[PDB]
Design a protein around this ligand. Structure first.
Ligand code: GDP
Ligand code: 0QX
Ligand code: MG
Length: 170
C-alpha cells in the first residue's frame, strides 16, 4: 500500500481542531461541530511528489478510559498542537500536550508542529513572537492558520508529514 501517515490533532476545546481537519479533508469551513465528537478521517494526497494517505485523528479530550488516550498517542506518528490566537489558556495548555505526548511515547523525538489557529480574527491575545519563542524552545515548526479562509492549512498538515519523514530517516 502507499505510505500512510498517522497524524493526531490535539489542543483545548474550541481551538479549531475539527474545523482544521474538515478544511483539510473536505475543503469546507464547518461553523459548528459538536465539541465532544472524536473521529478519524482519511485523505489521499501528494506531498512533494509522494502519493500518500493522511489518517488523521481529530481528538476531543478525555476518553472513556485513559488507556484510549495512551493508545492513540502511541499509534500517532506526528501531532498538530493547536491553540487559538485569541485564547491565552489554549496556548498555555500546549505545554501540557507537549509533555503528555512525550511521556506516553516515552520519547524525546516526537514529530510535532505548533499551530496558532483563527488568524483571520483581529482579536488576538497570543502574539506571533511569543508562539515563535515556544516553537524555538521545542525545535519544531510554527504555523498560523485559519480554518475559515484555509490559510496555512495544507502547510500545517504537510509540514507535519515532512517532520515525520525526518524522524523516520534516522
Ligand atoms: N474565525 C474562525 N473561527 C474558527 C476557526 N476555526 C474554528 N473556528 C470556530 O471556532 C469554534 C470551535 O471550532 P471547532 O473546530 O469545533 O474546535 P475544536 O473544539 O478544537 O474541534 C467554532 O465556532 C468554529 O467555527 C478559524 O480559523 N477562524
Ligand atoms: C492517529 C492515531 C490513531 C488513529 C486511528 C485509531 C483510532 N483511535 C481513535 C480514538 N477515538 C476515536 C476514533 C479512533 N480511531 C485512526 N486514525 C488514527 C490516526
Ligand atoms: Mg472538535
Amino acid at each position: 500500500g502507499m505510505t500512510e501517515y498517522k497524524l493526531v490533532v490535539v489542543g483545548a476545546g474550541g481551538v479549531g481542531k475539527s474545523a482544521l481537519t474538515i478544511q483539510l479533508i473536505q475543503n469546507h469551513f464547518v461553523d459548528e461541530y459538536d465539541p465532544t465528537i472524536e473521529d478519524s478521517y482519511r485523505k489521499q494526497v501528494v506531498i512533494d511528489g509522494e502519493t500518500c494517505l493522511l489518517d488523521i485523528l481529530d481528538t476531543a479530550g478525555q476518553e472513556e478510559y485513559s488507556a484510549m488516550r495512551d493508545q492513540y498517542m502511541r499509534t500517532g506518528e506526528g501531532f498538530l498542537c493547536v491553540f487559538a490566537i485569541n485564547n491565552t489558556k489554549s496556548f498555555e495548555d500546549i505545554h501540557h500536550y507537549r509533555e503528555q505526548i512525550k511521556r506516553v511515547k516515552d520519547s524525546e523525538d516526537v514529530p510535532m508542529v505548533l499551530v496558532g489557529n483563527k488568524s483571520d480574527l483581529p482579536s488576538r491575545t497570543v502574539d506571533t513572537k511569543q508562539a515563535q519563542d515556544l516553537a524555538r524552545s521545542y525545535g519544531i515548526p510554527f504555523i498560523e492558520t485559519s480554518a475559515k479562509t484555509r490559510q496555512g492549512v495544507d502547510d500545517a498538515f504537510y509540514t507535519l508529514v515532512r517532520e515525520i519523514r525526518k524522524h523516520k530517516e534516522k
